Amino acid sequence: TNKPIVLSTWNFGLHANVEAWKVLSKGGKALDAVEKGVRLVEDDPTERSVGYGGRPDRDGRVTLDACIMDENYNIGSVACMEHIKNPISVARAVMEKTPHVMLVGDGALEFALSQGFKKENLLTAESEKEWKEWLHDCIGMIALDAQGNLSGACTTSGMAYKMHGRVGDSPIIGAGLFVDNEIGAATATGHGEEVIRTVGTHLVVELMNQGRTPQQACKEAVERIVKIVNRRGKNLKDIQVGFIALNKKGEYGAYCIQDGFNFAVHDQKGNRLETPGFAL
Amino acid sequence: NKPIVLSTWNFGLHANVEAWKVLSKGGKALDAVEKGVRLVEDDPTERSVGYGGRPDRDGRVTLDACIMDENYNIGSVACMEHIKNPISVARAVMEKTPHVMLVGDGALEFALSQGFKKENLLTAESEKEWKEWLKHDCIGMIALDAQGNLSGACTTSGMAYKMHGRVGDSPIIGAGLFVDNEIGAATATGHGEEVIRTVGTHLVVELMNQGRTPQQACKEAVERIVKIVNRRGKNLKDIQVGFIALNKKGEYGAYCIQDGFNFAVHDQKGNRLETPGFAL
């Protein structure tokens, strides 16, 4: 088993991986490593994809989505939540502190406040400017720690200029994220609507359950999506979707509909940016 | 065995008589499942669906629903207020917008924009019981039509006195409902948190993709949930989850955790209430 190991989506996953390796290289839990890792990006306003500098919906509202899942089937999710910069951490409080698994809208913000989170203005002057002119989709991270346990986190501000209330795949278990500790974990990126439609990351893990490698599982799930966009008469060039995956032995893999997605991998060989296979 | 309609719980007999009015005439499975569950959304005496549904703990009735047709088109609304017919606003999300899921206030603004009428959904019986408290959980329906197309719908008012903002499995396409026209369809009922945790209905259909009969697929998915509640130190007696399923040949099946769940089946032999096997 290659352990510990962290994978995350896109370029900024290199930096996010350096914060998760601070937990993982000291033998900490994968759950804490993935929360620390993506919170780095939630905190950054120059990151316009995720949390604090996130582009608003069409009414000028920054509403965020995130979920988390640990090594023992516990899950928490928040979607369309406002004024709280770290939605991954309110999702961990839903998991840990409530008999529920998903809170949305105003009820997710009331619970965040009840848990001590601070209400902040998430709309930067740059984002408000571009919104009124208009008038890296997410970060997913999955890790295997030194006890050989898996956990994952996915967080986003959604599609810029989305309709007020729109929820994508990032807060939905089995679409932006799925973790089964006797099999493997996977997270998704892309047009969320398409990951929800195919229930993406649950399909990738179940293909690893049926004996596939992580890269093979990612590839066949992308090929199933390619088949369905053809069935729906859609043009593939308009749609993008990538998956990254990890199994229990620390083997990892990725694949996407189209070229140009990349992911960051940090194990005891160091941290690097790799470029997956692509269908189109 | 077509056309054929299945729906959850004893009120599924009556809901099935409205879907057979479309199915028996050659109409579309999509229209049959929407007409079928709207019957129950309309009835004030049905306290877990639509009008008359028990409110969250703040006395707000917020509803969840999704729909999926024979070609991976999907629509969903969650935590929506003041609209009696959430399955129909979910069909408008699918048909009229670039998104597949709207929640909270944004789902209600879009409903109004599409001509739906704002109504007060808390009955005098539900407000009484809510203030007393202050001191069958959904309907899922799946059908195969005379063209041999599958479609499904699931709608609920959620767990009574749930935290404000809680969303169950009913509006989530990996979870309360999944339809793949080359394989089969399934809908779920029970404690929504547990169906979300296990991506219930996507797992049932993928087990039918692997060759399981509808009843076998439902049974093995319930047994996976039983394994996971044991892995989490929880008591099975505290949980009920059931699945009903249908494949492309119109074979059907169901299974649950505890006894006492039945479902309604209407094909050309007639409409009847059947009782599946249970795990506990």
Mind giving me the DSSP string for chain B? --SEEEEESTTHHHHHHHHHHHHTTT--HHHHHHHHHHHHHH-TT-TTSSTT----TTS---EEEEEE-TTS-EEEEEEE-S-S-HHHHHHHHHHHSS-SEEEHHHHHHHHHHTTPPP-----HHHHHHHHHHH----EEEEEE-TTS-EEEEEEE--STTPPTTB--STT-TTTTEEEETTTEEEEEEE-HHHHHHTTHHHHHHHHHHTT--HHHHHHHHHHHHHHHHHHTT--GGG--EEEEEEETTS-EEEEESSS---EEEEETTEEEEE--EE--
Q: Are strands A64-69 and A75-81 parallel, antiparallel or unpaired?
A: antiparallel
- Between the two ends of chain B, the Cα-to-Cα distance in Å is 31
Beta carbons of A209 and A221 less than 8 angstroms apart: no
Helix (H), strand (E) at residue A142: strand A139-144
User: Which single residue is written with the structure tokens 């629903």?
Assistant: B65
- Distance of alpha carbon A19 from the chain centroid: 16
Q: Using CA atoms, how far apart are residues A233 and A192, in angstroms rounded to an integer?
A: 18
Q: Is A219 helix (H, G, I), strand (E, B) or coil?
A: helix
Q: Is A22 helix (H, G, I), strand (E, B) or coil?
A: helix
Residues linked to residue B277 through DSSP beta bridges, in sequence order: B255
Q: How far is CA A17 from CA A14, A71, A232, A256, in A?
A: 5, 19, 37, 21
Q: Angle at Cα A78 formed by Cα A248 and Cα A100, nearest 5°?
A: 80
Residue A3 phi, psi (nearest 5) = -145, 150
From chain B, the residues in CB contact with A156 under 8 A are: none
Contacts of B227 (CB under 8 A, 6+ apart): none
Burial of A104 (0-12, 13-18, 19+ CB in 10 A): buried
Q: How far is CA A55 from CA A67, A130, A136, B74, B121, in A?
A: 19, 9, 12, 25, 35
**What contacts 24+ positions apart, CB below 8 Å, involve B84-88?**
B84/B41, B84/B42, B84/B50, B84/B51, B84/B117, B84/B119, B84/B121, B85/B38, B85/B41, B85/B42, B85/B50, B85/B116, B86/B41, B86/B50, B86/B155, B87/B34, B87/B37, B87/B38, B87/B41, B87/B153, B87/B155, B88/B34, B88/B38, B88/B116
Beta carbons of A280 and A223 less than 8 angstroms apart: no
Joined tokens for residue B39:
């019957």
How many CB atoms within 10 Å of residue B230?
11
Contacts of A265 (CB under 8 A, 6+ apart): A5, A6, A7, A17, A252, A271, A272, A273, A274
Helix (H), strand (E) at residue A127: helix A125-134
Closest CA to B142 of B241, B255, B66: B66
Q: Using CA atoms, how far apart are residues B117 and B66, in angstroms rounded to an integer?
A: 19
CB contact under 8 A, A231 and B197: no
Closest CB to A102 among B97, B164, B167:
B167
Beta carbons of B103 and A167 less than 8 angstroms apart: yes
Q: Is A87 helix (H, G, I), strand (E, B) or coil?
A: helix
Q: Using CA atoms, how far apart are residues B7 and B113, in angstroms rounded to an integer?
A: 31
In the PDB record, what is the listed experimental method? X-ray
Q: Is A13 helix (H, G, I), strand (E, B) or coil?
A: helix
Q: Using CA atoms, how far apart are residues B156 and B77, in angstroms rounded to an integer?
A: 11
Give the full edge-to-edge strand order of the sheet including B177-180.
B177-180, B184-190, B241-247, B252-256, B277-278
CA of A91 vs chain B CAs: smallest distance (Å): 12
Q: Using CA atoms, how far apart are residues B200 and A73, in angstroms rounded to an integer?
A: 13
Beta carbons of A66 and A91 less than 8 angstroms apart: yes
Closest CB to B163 among A74, A111, A166:
A111
Q: Using CA atoms, how far apart are residues B1 and A145, in angstroms rounded to an integer?
A: 50
Where does residue A250 fall: left (phi above 0), alpha (psi -120 to 50 degrees), or beta otherwise? left
Interface of A with B (CB under 8 A): 57, 72-75, 79-80, 98-108, 110-111, 162-167, 172-175, 178, 193, 196-199, 202-203, 206, 210, 228, 231-232
Overall domain count for chain A: 1
Q: Are strands B63-68 and B150-156 parallel, antiparallel or unpaired?
A: antiparallel
CA of A272 vs chain B CAs: smallest distance (Å): 32
Q: Is A197 helix (H, G, I), strand (E, B) or coil?
A: helix
Beta carbons of A222 and A243 less than 8 angstroms apart: yes
For B1, what's the count of Cα atoms within 13 Å in the CB-facing half-sphere? Answer: 16
Beta carbons of B33 and B152 less than 8 angstroms apart: yes
From chain A, the residues in CB contact with B79 under 8 A are: 104-105, 107
Q: Are strands B74-80 and B101-103 parallel, antiparallel or unpaired?
A: parallel
Q: Which value, in Å, is the radius of gyration of the alpha carbons in chain B?
A: 17
For B154, what's the count of Cα atoms within 13 Å in the CB-facing half-sphere? Answer: 35
Beta carbons of B153 and B11 less than 8 angstroms apart: no
Closest CA to B195 of B154, B252, B151, B250: B154
Q: How many CB pairs under 8 A join A and B?
A: 132
Helix (H), strand (E) at residue A203: helix A200-209
Q: Using CA atoms, how far apart are residues B48 and B63, in angstroms rounded to an integer?
A: 9
Helix (H), strand (E) at residue A14: helix A13-24
From chain A, the residues in CB contact with B174 under 8 A are: 172-175, 196, 199, 202
Which DSSP category does A173 fall into? B
Q: Which domain, by its residues, includes A163? A: 1-280
Q: Using CA atoms, how far apart are residues B50 and B75, in angstroms rounded to an integer?
A: 17
Helix (H), strand (E) at residue A69: strand A64-69
